[PDB]
Amino acid sequence: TVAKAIFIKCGNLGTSMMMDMLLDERADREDVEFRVVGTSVKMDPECVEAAVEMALDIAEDFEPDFIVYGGPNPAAPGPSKAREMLADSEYPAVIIGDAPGLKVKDEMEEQGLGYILVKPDAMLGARREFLDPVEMAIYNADLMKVLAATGVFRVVQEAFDELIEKAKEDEISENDLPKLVIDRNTLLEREEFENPYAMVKAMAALEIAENVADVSVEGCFVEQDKERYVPIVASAHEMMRKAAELADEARELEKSNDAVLRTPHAPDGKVLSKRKFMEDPE
Amino acid sequence: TVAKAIFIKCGNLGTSMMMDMLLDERADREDVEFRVVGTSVKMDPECVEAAVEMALDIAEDFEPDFIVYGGPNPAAPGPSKAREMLADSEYPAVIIGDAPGLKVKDEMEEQGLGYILVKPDAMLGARREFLDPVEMAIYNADLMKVLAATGVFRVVQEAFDELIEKAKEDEISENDLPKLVIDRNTLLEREEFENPYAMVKAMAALEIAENVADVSVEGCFVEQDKERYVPIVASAHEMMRKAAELADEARELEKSNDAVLRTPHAPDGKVLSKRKFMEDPE
Amino acid sequence: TVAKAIFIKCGNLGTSMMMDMLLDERADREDVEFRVVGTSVKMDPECVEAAVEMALDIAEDFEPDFIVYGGPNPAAPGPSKAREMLADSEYPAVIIGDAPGLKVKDEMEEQGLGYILVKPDAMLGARREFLDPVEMAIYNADLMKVLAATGVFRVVQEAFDELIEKAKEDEISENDLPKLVIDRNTLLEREEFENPYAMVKAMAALEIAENVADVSVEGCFVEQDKERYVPIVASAHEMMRKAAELADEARELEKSNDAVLRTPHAPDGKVLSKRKFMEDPE
Amino acid sequence: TVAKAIFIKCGNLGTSMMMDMLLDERADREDVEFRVVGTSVKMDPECVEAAVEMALDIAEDFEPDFIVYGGPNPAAPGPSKAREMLADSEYPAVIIGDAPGLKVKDEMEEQGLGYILVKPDAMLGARREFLDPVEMAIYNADLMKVLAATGVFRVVQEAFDELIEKAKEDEISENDLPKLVIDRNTLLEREEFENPYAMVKAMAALEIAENVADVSVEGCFVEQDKERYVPIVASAHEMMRKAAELADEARELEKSNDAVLRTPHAPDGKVLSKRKFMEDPE
Amino acid sequence: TVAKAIFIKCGNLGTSMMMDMLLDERADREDVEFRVVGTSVKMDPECVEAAVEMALDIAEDFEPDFIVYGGPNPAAPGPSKAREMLADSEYPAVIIGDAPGLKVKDEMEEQGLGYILVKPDAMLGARREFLDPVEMAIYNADLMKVLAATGVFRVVQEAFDELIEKAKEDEISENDLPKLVIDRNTLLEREEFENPYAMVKAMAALEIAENVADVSVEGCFVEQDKERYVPIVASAHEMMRKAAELADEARELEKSNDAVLRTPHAPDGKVLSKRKFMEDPE
Amino acid sequence: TVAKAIFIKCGNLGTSMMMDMLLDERADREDVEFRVVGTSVKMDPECVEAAVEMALDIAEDFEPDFIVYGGPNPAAPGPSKAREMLADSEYPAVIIGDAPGLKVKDEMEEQGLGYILVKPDAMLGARREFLDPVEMAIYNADLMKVLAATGVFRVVQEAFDELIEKAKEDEISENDLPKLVIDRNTLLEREEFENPYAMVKAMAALEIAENVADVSVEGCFVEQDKERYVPIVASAHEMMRKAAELADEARELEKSNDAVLRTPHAPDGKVLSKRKFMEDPE
Ligand SMILES: [Mg+2]
Ligand SMILES: [Mg+2]
Ligand SMILES: [Mg+2]
Ligand SMILES: [Mg+2]
Ligand SMILES: [Mg+2]
Ligand SMILES: [Mg+2]
Ligand SMILES: [Mg+2]
Ligand SMILES: [Mg+2]
Numbered sequence A, B, C, D, E, F: 001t002v003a004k005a006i007f008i009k010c011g012n013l014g015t016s017m018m019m020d021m022l023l024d025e026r027a028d029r030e031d032v033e034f035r036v037v038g039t040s041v042k043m044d045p046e047c048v049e050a051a052v053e054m055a056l057d058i059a060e061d062f063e064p065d066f067i068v069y070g071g072p073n074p075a076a077p078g079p080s081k082a083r084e085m086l087a088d089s090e091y092p093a094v095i096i097g098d099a100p101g102l103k104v105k106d107e108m109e110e111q112g113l114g115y116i117l118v119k120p121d122a123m124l125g126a127r128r129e130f131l132d133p134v135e136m137a138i139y140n141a142d143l144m145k146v147l148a149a150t151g152v153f154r155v156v157q158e159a160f161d162e163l164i165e166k167a168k169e170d171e172i173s174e175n176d177l178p179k180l181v182i183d184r185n186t187l188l189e190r191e192e193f194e195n196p197y198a199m200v201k202a203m204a205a206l207e208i209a210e211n212v213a214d215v216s217v218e219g220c221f222v223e224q225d226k227e228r229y230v231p232i233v234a235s236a237h238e239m240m241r242k243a244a245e246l247a248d249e250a251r252e253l254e255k256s257n258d259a260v261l262r263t264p265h266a267p268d269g270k271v272l273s274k275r276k277f278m279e280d281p282e
Helices: A014-018 A045-062 A077-087 A099-110 A133-149 A152-168 A184-189 A196-222 A226-256 B014-018 B045-062 B077-087 B099-110 B133-149 B152-168 B184-189 B196-222 B226-256 C014-018 C045-062 C077-087 C099-110 C133-149 C152-168 C184-189 C196-222 C226-256 D014-018 D045-062 D077-088 D099-110 D133-149 D152-167 D184-189 D196-222 D226-256 E014-018 E045-062 E077-087 E099-110 E133-149 E152-168 E184-189 E196-222 E226-256 F014-018 F045-062 F077-088 F099-110 F133-149 F152-167 F184-189 F196-222 F226-256
Strands: A003-009 A032-038 A066-070 A093-097 A114-118 A179-182 B003-009 B032-038 B066-070 B093-097 B114-118 B179-182 C003-009 C032-038 C066-070 C093-098 C114-118 C179-182 D003-010 D032-040 D066-070 D093-097 D114-118 D179-182 E003-009 E032-038 E066-070 E093-098 E114-118 E179-182 F003-010 F032-040 F066-070 F093-097 F114-118 F179-182
Touching: A003 A045, A003 A152, A014 A114, A014 A133, A014 A152, A032 A045, A032 B045, A045 A066, A045 A077, A045 B032, A066 A077, A066 A152, A077 A093, A077 A099, A093 A099, A099 A114, A099 A179, A114 A152, A133 A152, A133 A196, A133 A226, A133 B133, A133 B152, A152 A179, A152 B133, A184 A196, A184 C226, A196 A226, A196 C196, A196 C226, A226 C184, A226 C196, A226 C226, A226 D226, A226 E226, B003 B045, B003 B152, B014 B114, B014 B133, B014 B152, B032 B045, B045 B066, B045 B077, B066 B077, B066 B152, B077 B093, B077 B099, B093 B099, B099 B114, B099 B179, B114 B152, B133 B152, B133 B196, B133 B226, B152 B179, B184 B196, B184 E226, B196 B226, B196 E196, B196 E226, B226 C226, B226 E184, B226 E196, B226 E226, B226 F226, C003 C045, C003 C152, C014 C114, C014 C133, C014 C152, C032 C045, C032 D045, C045 C066, C045 C077, C045 D032, C066 C077, C066 C152, C077 C093, C077 C099, C093 C099, C099 C114, C099 C179, C114 C152, C133 C152, C133 C196, C133 C226, C133 D133, C133 D152, C152 C179, C152 D133, C184 C196, C196 C226, C226 F226, D003 D045, D003 D077, D003 D152, D014 D114, D014 D133, D014 D152, D032 D045, D045 D066, D045 D077, D066 D077, D066 D152, D077 D093, D077 D099, D093 D099, D093 D152, D099 D114, D099 D179, D114 D152, D133 D152, D133 D196, D133 D226, D152 D179, D184 D196, D184 F226, D196 D226, D196 F196, D196 F226, D226 E226, D226 F184, D226 F196, D226 F226, E003 E045, E003 E152, E014 E114, E014 E133, E014 E152, E032 E045, E032 F045, E045 E066, E045 E077, E045 F032, E066 E077, E066 E152, E077 E093, E077 E099, E093 E099, E099 E114, E099 E179, E114 E152, E133 E152, E133 E196, E133 E226, E133 F133, E133 F152, E152 E179, E152 F133, E184 E196, E196 E226, F003 F045, F003 F077, F003 F152, F014 F114, F014 F133, F014 F152, F032 F045, F045 F066, F045 F077, F066 F077, F066 F152, F077 F093, F077 F099, F093 F099, F093 F152, F099 F114, F099 F179, F114 F152, F133 F152, F133 F196, F133 F226, F152 F179, F184 F196, F196 F226
Parallel strands: A003 A032, A003 A066, A066 A093, A093 A114, A114 A179, B003 B032, B003 B066, B066 B093, B093 B114, B114 B179, C003 C032, C003 C066, C066 C093, C093 C114, C114 C179, D003 D032, D003 D066, D066 D093, D093 D114, D114 D179, E003 E032, E003 E066, E066 E093, E093 E114, E114 E179, F003 F032, F003 F066, F066 F093, F093 F114, F114 F179
Antiparallel strands: A032 B032, C032 D032, E032 F032
16 A cells, blocks of 8 residues: 655745655655645745645645645744645645744644644744855755754654554544654654764754754844844854754764664665664664 | 746755755745646656656646756656656756766757756665665755855856746747756856865865765665675765865855855846855845 | 952852953053952852952952952842842942843842843753763863853953943942943954954854753753753753854954954053954054 | 861962862852952962962961962962961961972972872963963863863862861871872873773873973063064964863763763762763762 | 895885885884885886886895885886886786776786785876975875775785795795785775774775876876866865875774774784774784 | 985984975976985894995995985984994985984084984884884874974975085085974974964974874883883874874965965976965966
């Protein structure tokens, strides 16, 4: 049995960039089929409605088991429109967002929607005087390293792998949909790191990443004097570059102990596991 | 006038991940509208045909000025199917690929297709014993840093910004479509770096990135003994992590000279430019 | 001529550690004379009363133009007892503290006391399972580097030096007592850095340092499960270590531009200035 | 029993900055009480006399079990005056100093004084053209990191904790006073590091720190041409920065082995011990 | 007992620099005696003939069991003249060279010569506008670190040591002459590293080092525009510097596991072995 | 005119490894011809005599303008034998050695010999339990980097190039022979570095390198307990590794200012100069 899902991407978040690929890392899974659609970085109501309409049009013939909408701020006008539309459909749906989505957690539960809110997936320093295409890619590279090496992406992988198993049995109820809020403390109960200083460095990285959002918000929405907001948004990006270095340090500590956790998918979808470098995943 | 384009993403390449977002980094461009569709990491003929069918179905009402297909190896069976389908349509199209696409350069020109082949966008170490979702994200983070900080993404941004200006006048001929092959030497004629050692470090990074592909190919397709191919594909990822460090070093050298090039888009689409940190882009 | 002051130290703050020495770095100023007294790390009301008693006791013959009380949380029982005793004395006083001091900011202005509150001077992870003497010294070394290389200590040096001048004019009124709150944004109003990225890295260092406090507070006072609070306080120390590294990176950028600001004292007390390494300070 | 001591600080040494704090890192010991006095950085005969007078006057009602004088060069005029005054007093006393103190080791033994001479606690590059307040704080941050992470501060902690136990017998014989000389080779007799390379990197850091003193002395007291002495004193600071980086590397090695030694004090003064991060100190 | 050999050095290779010293690291072996002769960096046929003449001249009385010729490109005119003269002599010979030596591999086996071709021993960026004496020494330092820390020099040490044993048995036949080609994959057949990531980082270092050669060749012999060839040769040197850093990182991983392999010679010549730092070599 | 010289190498010193190569970095000088002979690492009286005999025998027909003997400790038995033999010969000669050579500086002057004594060229940690071939190569790679990047090799290059010009007069007076002692302070009289912090970091690297010798001597010739001497010699190597990192940092600072001094030789032997990367050497 093959699980099917549609992913909708409007605006950009580190987790939404990677969400679907974390589920079939080598494209050799025989038990899933996905469609991805979106309006690139635009996330205003008009564009989001168009993205969701594309998804629901495709859904008629594709018959997805679930639909995922990912992008910044579930509480903003565009994303709110996607929530209304998905909540109004027959398809089980999950919203992937950032910390600002906490504001509409109750609304989503009432809408029968699942959610994964990633607090360290911080908004970048989006002022024209600082953020050009290259800087936007450098920041996303640092954020991707943080979310991957700290183990945050493994939490997302697990949540979706569980939903995929239920999708195969056409047994996805509203109570099966995730209601997750990820942050620094999430790491305390993961079996991610064998070395404790790796866990602690990873936690420091996620704390710094979560803190970057407040700096970006101050420089993009509060401060209006350019002589002040340009340095402010740039400082947010310097923070994120150091958070990636902490995440890199944590991973190198696991390498020193030959204890790097790897959880690849088998062709039939089963999530395997290994720690030692030369050990086969099982 | 608003330029419209559809991006199709099958399989994953660092350049295809970012291609559309490099054109509207803060989502405030009033002169473009994009639709993005794809089948995630799957790039076999069946999936690619489905992705292209989605795009062409959307194209009827969306009326794009051009269509872009991005993903690994334009010469593989799946991508070749996309090339046939796009070549058979009325829509000007561009193929974004990696070095293996060089094999079908002549075919694409005969098909009336543009192309941007990025040699340093290297295939990862895709063996199940090593590549799990987290490792696949860490590698992509390093590759994204390399492609961004060396200036490769600025070359892509420029090529598409030129096509967008022509799209606005509905004047995109086959001769206007790009025919670009990017590698280490491309950097020699860019006005990217003010400091020469930054350029030289960026070139070293792209050379190492291009070389990673041969290692990944050896470990994934040639070597069949796991005691040998697992270390081989892992060594490819260690190379890419050092290429990202070189790219980071180049950018820090530009920072030391307060000469970091930034080329953000104005709301009307115009590509602005600046070097000094406190200088407004113009 | 020759101003005099008494410094009282109870508990420890990075700023209180260095405050007096920042005013006579080579012990060759002839316009100042200082006395330092305290009860070491203890800062309970009994111990703080004893410390101010010592200060007030020696003030009788020493005759200080002003007295300084420095240590953590001026809102706590111990430090509050000290503000009480100093406000009702015949010597103008200044309170050096950290962010919690903001709770009693107005109360201090009402008491006729001066103050310098350093937000980035963060409480450390004071849990017995983690913080031994060596770890405390390591954390203080990192904090000392942050406060010094970001330029925060220069702001403090300048405040006390201006007061030392007002004091020589035997006219120290309340309107002369400093009323400073120092944080990341303090750097925007300074000319500390010639290189813009050095200032932005220094800002990021101060933001991380300020954020360390919330983590230490959670681990010391809120979280009660030791499997969680030990990793939490350690993650605060890993954050500070990276803040120290950003501060170091900033200073190295100034070195690359041969623009390290140095403001040494002359024997008469005047603050000289220089930027180039081989430039005499004027 | 509650042991009591008075610490006198004139001039600045890394060990004198931290000595008292190393004995009650979280201020929760109920078996000790300290008073700290001094004249800040000034250490001339006049100031040191005043410093010891304050101490002796306080000693009257405080009734300490021992007195500690810490500062650079026990052989200089001021410190020599302090040695005579303390040697003459009724209180058992210990002198904390640097390598120049070796010149009067026999003399202190005849004066009935204890001593802890720390060779790596090197004099800084005190030339006006180079050493301003910020540079002095940066140097001290590096030196503190070296003395902490190499284990030197634990040697000092242990010596005083041993004396405090003796004091609880209200009988400190001259025989009980420490007579220690600490340097690179001190580590060979300790079990500070579980990893041998961490021990040898720590030894290299202490050797470099010890060697800094000779460079500082040359630039401050021998070389008279500013074109030569400013570079000489700055080179001493670059050496101390790298010593701190070596000490940091040693500690990260202990982290990789989850073997960081921690020896916190219990509320009753007992020194506990632990190696594994998640293990309770016992 | 006491084997003898003559080493001839013309031109420079990292391996030829170190080959003889790797056999008697502390100059205390009593089973070997060596003579070294050459014409420095010159390797033209006239200079190489003179060097072999010296060797053959001293061989008359010295009576070497074997002669070694080491330097770049055994396929070039100069080195070919040396293979000619050595193959037609009464002393068994071995040729140490780099990758270009593969062109004449069969030709050398036909000449009855032994060989050790080190692929990672890459030609440097020998253009006058870039390579001065200091840059050449820097490049050689990085290459020397790569060849040593990755374990390549141990492979070479072992080849010559086994030959030295065959030589003492006065039975050195052609079947005893080494026929080695060393590259990244050579490490897969060794037990050099206890930590798997140290071996993978060492493999990546050797792959980058091998790739440096193609870049140097392009800049020195193909590219003719100086605005392009100077950056090209410099990028090859930046690559080697990162290869040296990966090799260093690998060695540090072995240190973290206290597993640095050491194979020192005993006075009698037997190769001892040890892994733990404090373990006597047996 | 074609100057000729013979280099004799017994034992190993960093300066003796590179001395001849520093004079013809690309082997294109047509004004010089060299012969190099030696006994590898052995430097006992027997071997050194044989070494000088080879040289003197070759000198007959070669007819060099001067002879150079390079190796550790000019004062040891073997080197002393070489000094006597060369002093007695008809050829002007120069002795290259390390700091122990200072012991016979007056003697060499009376022997009519020139000398270049390099204090930072430190003896390595030659204890069997620690120094195997790989460790020796690693140490030498770090030392080479220090002597190259700090500018010491340029001092040596210049001294010999000055002597070669004299030799082209077929008249080298004793007065023409170099009498140099190189150490940290040598940099103060050079204009090697455009950036002053690069100069002081290079000075710090040479100081650390010079200080390594004393640690090595202690572990090799003074300390007899293996539990103490193995850590001692390994600590000397950790110091040299950090000295190399400092020298690397100095060079990267020159790169940031596009001010890397390069002084390549022209085909006729003239020494050219350039600072800016893209500028031709003149
Ligand atoms: Mg439903
Ligand atoms: Mg409902
Ligand atoms: Mg169910
Ligand atoms: Mg067409
Ligand atoms: Mg056509
Ligand atoms: Mg046209
Ligand atoms: Mg439990
Ligand atoms: Mg031109």
